[PDB]
Design an enzyme around this catalytic site. Sequence first.
Site, PDB file in Angstrom:
ATOM      1  N   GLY A   8      -9.761  -7.558  -5.204  1.00 33.81           N
ATOM      2  CA  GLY A   8      -9.284  -8.388  -4.106  1.00 33.81           C
ATOM      3  C   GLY A   8     -10.400  -8.395  -3.072  1.00 33.81           C
ATOM      4  O   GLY A   8     -10.700  -7.318  -2.527  1.00 33.81           O
ATOM      5  N   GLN A  11      -9.502 -10.209   3.450  1.00 35.76           N
ATOM      6  CA  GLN A  11      -9.777  -9.545   4.639  1.00 35.76           C
ATOM      7  C   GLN A  11      -9.926  -8.000   4.463  1.00 35.76           C
ATOM      8  O   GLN A  11     -10.955  -7.434   4.887  1.00 35.76           O
ATOM      9  CB  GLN A  11      -8.729  -9.851   5.741  1.00 35.76           C
ATOM     10  CG  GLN A  11      -9.068 -11.057   6.615  1.00 35.76           C
ATOM     11  CD  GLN A  11     -10.302 -10.836   7.533  1.00 35.76           C
ATOM     12  OE1 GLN A  11     -11.430 -11.023   7.071  1.00 35.76           O
ATOM     13  NE2 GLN A  11     -10.086 -10.396   8.806  1.00 35.76           N
ATOM     14  N   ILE A  12      -8.903  -7.346   3.926  1.00 31.30           N
ATOM     15  CA  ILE A  12      -8.844  -5.934   3.810  1.00 31.30           C
ATOM     16  C   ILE A  12      -9.964  -5.440   2.928  1.00 31.30           C
ATOM     17  O   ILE A  12     -10.745  -4.553   3.338  1.00 31.30           O
ATOM     18  CB  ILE A  12      -7.524  -5.445   3.387  1.00 31.30           C
ATOM     19  CG1 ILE A  12      -6.499  -5.749   4.472  1.00 31.30           C
ATOM     20  CG2 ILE A  12      -7.601  -3.889   3.258  1.00 31.30           C
ATOM     21  CD1 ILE A  12      -5.059  -5.430   4.158  1.00 31.30           C
ATOM     22  N   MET A 142      -1.942   3.425   0.050  1.00 38.27           N
ATOM     23  CA  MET A 142      -2.004   3.685   1.447  1.00 38.27           C
ATOM     24  C   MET A 142      -0.911   2.980   2.192  1.00 38.27           C
ATOM     25  O   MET A 142      -0.739   1.763   2.098  1.00 38.27           O
ATOM     26  CB  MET A 142      -3.430   3.417   2.008  1.00 38.27           C
ATOM     27  CG  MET A 142      -3.760   2.386   2.980  1.00 38.27           C
ATOM     28  SD  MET A 142      -2.831   2.304   4.527  1.00 38.27           S
ATOM     29  CE  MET A 142      -2.820   0.479   4.421  1.00 38.27           C
ATOM     30  N   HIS A 174       7.042   2.175   3.119  1.00 31.85           N
ATOM     31  CA  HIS A 174       6.366   1.389   4.123  1.00 31.85           C
ATOM     32  C   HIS A 174       7.334   0.138   4.346  1.00 31.85           C
ATOM     33  O   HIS A 174       7.115  -0.961   3.832  1.00 31.85           O
ATOM     34  CB  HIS A 174       4.988   0.976   3.585  1.00 31.85           C
ATOM     35  CG  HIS A 174       4.149   0.197   4.562  1.00 31.85           C
ATOM     36  ND1 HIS A 174       3.910   0.641   5.850  1.00 31.85           N
ATOM     37  CD2 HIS A 174       3.437  -0.957   4.425  1.00 31.85           C
ATOM     38  CE1 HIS A 174       3.161  -0.244   6.486  1.00 31.85           C
ATOM     39  NE2 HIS A 174       2.834  -1.201   5.638  1.00 31.85           N
TER      40      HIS A 174
END
Lengths: 313, 313, 313, 313
Positions: A8, A11-12, A142, A174
């Site tokens: 991927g 952005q991240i 994470m 999360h």
Amino acid sequence: MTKIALIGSGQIGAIVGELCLLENLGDLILYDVVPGIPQGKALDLKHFSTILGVNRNILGTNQIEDIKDADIIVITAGVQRKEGMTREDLIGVNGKIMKSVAESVKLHCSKAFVICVSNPLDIMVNVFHKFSNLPHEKICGMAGILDTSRYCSLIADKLKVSAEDVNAVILGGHGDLMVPLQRYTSVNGVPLSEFVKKNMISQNEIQEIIQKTRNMGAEIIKLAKASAAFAPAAAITKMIKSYLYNENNLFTCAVYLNGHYNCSNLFVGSTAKINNKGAHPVEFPLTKEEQDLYTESIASVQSNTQKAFDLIK
Amino acid sequence: MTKIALIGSGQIGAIVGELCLLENLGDLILYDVVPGIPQGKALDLKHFSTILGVNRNILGTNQIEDIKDADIIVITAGVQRKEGMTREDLIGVNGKIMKSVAESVKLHCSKAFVICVSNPLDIMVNVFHKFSNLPHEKICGMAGILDTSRYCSLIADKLKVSAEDVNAVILGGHGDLMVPLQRYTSVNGVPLSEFVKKNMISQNEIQEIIQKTRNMGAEIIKLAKASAAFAPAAAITKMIKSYLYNENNLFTCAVYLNGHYNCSNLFVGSTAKINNKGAHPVEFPLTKEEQDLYTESIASVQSNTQKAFDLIK
Amino acid sequence: MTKIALIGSGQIGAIVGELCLLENLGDLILYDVVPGIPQGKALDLKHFSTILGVNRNILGTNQIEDIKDADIIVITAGVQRKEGMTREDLIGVNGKIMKSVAESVKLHCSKAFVICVSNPLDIMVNVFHKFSNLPHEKICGMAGILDTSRYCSLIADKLKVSAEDVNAVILGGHGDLMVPLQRYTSVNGVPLSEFVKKNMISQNEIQEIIQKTRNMGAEIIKLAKASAAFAPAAAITKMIKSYLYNENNLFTCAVYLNGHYNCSNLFVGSTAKINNKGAHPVEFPLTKEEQDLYTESIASVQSNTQKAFDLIK
Amino acid sequence: MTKIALIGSGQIGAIVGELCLLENLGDLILYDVVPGIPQGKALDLKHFSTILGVNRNILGTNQIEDIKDADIIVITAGVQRKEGMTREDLIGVNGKIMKSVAESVKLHCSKAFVICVSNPLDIMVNVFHKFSNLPHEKICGMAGILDTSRYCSLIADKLKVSAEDVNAVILGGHGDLMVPLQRYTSVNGVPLSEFVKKNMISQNEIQEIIQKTRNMGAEIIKLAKASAAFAPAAAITKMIKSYLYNENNLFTCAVYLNGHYNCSNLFVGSTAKINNKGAHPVEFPLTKEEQDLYTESIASVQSNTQKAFDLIK
């Protein structure tokens, strides 16, 4: 010599790649399904590297076989949520993507340590484990370092202290069912309960903060019109570091529970250590009430996981 | 105590904010015209700060009056070019935006050092000077560092050396009329001409590299479907660092020329030093052929700067 | 009593307002985002009205709520293209502006008839529909009448005849993929094919004319340094007139197709009648080759419309 | 057969062209110094003509010799004023342009009727006369119809009546020293004084209206960011119509005075008739106080005309 593979290149992924370059953690492999995108970001990262005097290798690719012999894998592939959506609304489309990535990791680099980040996070970690055929310690997700950073940040602002040494444990998925533990919150060692006794913060102010922590992901989406990218990447980079450098740091992340906290056979947000050998849960003595809250969060993750496995056929 | 104001909270602005937080350069003021966007990116940056142990203050705002008493101003406000467009196509829409920002800086913080980044770069620096009423040494634009990083990066790859100490001078506008100087290219001190004599690189390979340097901005747009963000931000940060820390570093950037290189009364890409007092051009002895190429680049910047002033009414 | 609201007070809007005044079509509401501009043009239009003996009311305003109870809405808000740009280059910036206008029409005057003119035309009509929540028959865009006037104007010149009764059908998007129909071109009733048989015009001369019709919008921009304003305004006015007076005239304009010409769920240039109730498509029997060309134009409009929806997030 | 030549293809020129086409007043010759501009507007005006069923010939040109055998000439060539400028600030630059146009008219079409519109208006009519070598009755300028429109328009608003048959005389230069005559102001015949007696309007309200009439030109500049174009063009068209059609209408315009109103050898705003033979002044009996105001206006126009002639060397 260390190879870090970013599955991927959004952005991240790019920022994780940027942070890895800043600390010289490894050579990068930037992978995406969309042609041209990783090659272009790789070019921009090389020019970045040249200005800052970093010299690691950076390869942008659409061939997933380039992931071979990666020591580390960061998976951000998938869709992100928009305003009004929950994380869980991505379950259908992301589960299928996560399975495909799992199948690719399985045949190309079965020895890697795998940090999953696609939402909904806990669920997608479970999907990756099911189809990857990797040991459970070698897989994690994470989230807890992100949710802890937001909760500590807010606690710090209300106490007029540096966030630098506000630490906390957040257990659970999360999502809306996170369980921040007041008992396991400290300010450079000093328990949060001392600051309530000293009237510097009230139980209500804390419940307010816990609510903001829960919604924070949505609040950023609403304000920035895109989902948080800098903090997630920093968290990821912290988990990569703890693996590469055998640091054995004690975080919250999504990890394989196996009798811990009355839960077995599920990846869910929990206290864990990360070292050379992977992510290893650790059980701390909870109160009845704490454990009851945690178990409730674990139940959602269970349900939504099953939902995910079902929607994949 | 240092205040850094980012006028524009897009990709470049946010990453600049990020890199400023990583080196503790100052407190951030994240400004944008679009409501919510800065407030959300500020939140993400706060959480990022908490995880990395940085403690500077970060304020996301839509009220441009919050820019007061900024020591540094980074202007990225404006539209970016898409595939098939030139930087010069933005002249109409970005000139107007740059003037408005100029007017705001004029009344709110006239003592700041101002790094312009909006395209077309050189032209928009000249617009900002016109309407800002700041001294010319207190205004510049970043470009040459980015173009140089690209050129040096490619030279380093062909020579099989670290890019770390490949240095070069590129004169002229940030566009197709850049003038990379072979004579002023070195590899840890050793001139590029020594590597041609040693047959490690050819004059044709160098011309190829110069062409890729010119088109790089467009190539990244084509591949990544967005314009370059990381390398621009790193370049910006390097210029901020040279101003804050009085480093007196010698870069190429858009600077006020005043009898240097047979040019006067124009901001254009040139050799300059940055320190406490701003950006100061330095003239080096060019050959006739070099100067001719440079003058030609200067001419386009002249024309297009006039065009920009005209199109602002 | 009729209220005509011009959303956008640039060249086209003002001239439309000028033509509406000349025919006493209605009271004007001149709206723009930029303060002072509509008020000043309203003043000039009042004085113009006093000299020519027209007495309709003219209001210049920056408050979009003044659009309430408009019977007719003309939308010209948006940026115009410069030399070397295509209409499609404006997709990003104008889509956003169109959506915002849509949202305003939605809450302030949902019963109006809406003529869209912002470029690229067909695309922007589709955007307006999407966010306006009006009926599809109450929305259209002007283009065909302009392209037809050009094509007919050129045919007339080559045949040495008055343009007054040269009529023609042009199908498809307002762009390079227009499909002028020779079969549906007549000179005061006499088909164009009779003039080819009589050797007054050749098939090649016709293909030349079709090319000039396609490029005409660009050619004016090149010569006049601004986009065409008089002919677009006259076209608009003709569609207003056909609505207000229930004329049921048969034009080409961007209209909601719904099984017509093998196309559904898209606004695109097509044969349509305008009356009291809005714009209504009419299907005529095309040859295979004609339909193939038309479908090809429809495909671009499809693609670019999707692109536009995508770029709005 | 009638040829109308527009010397100047800006806003005013093009609209005049448009209004002439609407009433079929003549073939157009669109002249400008700037290449391409008249050709492009001429294309637009042809397409306009095609849609509205007007068939007159329209020629865009940069060759001033194409002005041969024009029956009518409209001169808008020159610069316009911006915010903060007076009309009189254009004296230097426009005098020179006017002279050049005078010289061209002199050698190419000495039999035309010439309507001057370039500012400052009265002054520039004196310039045209000096260098053109045409009879004085064949030259005039438009202004008084514009100023009369504004004043009658404001009177009409205050009285809650149609502006249609509010008529008035304004004498003097097109500037701050206009002299609107209350005594020569009627509402469908009824003198303005009858409405003051009936308390429908007060002497103060009228002074207010006279001030707004004076400043109107600047007020539109300020609001619209361009100078009035529609009303001027209409006023021009009205004078063209009174000449072509031998109407003998009684207007105010800049005309050669020759013992009328104690003034000789000067073009200045005054009561005049226009017919087949040109513009002919007519003297009406003024009071002492009226004539004193009018003489004071005539003095500025004198001074400024001398200034213009001086600046032409």
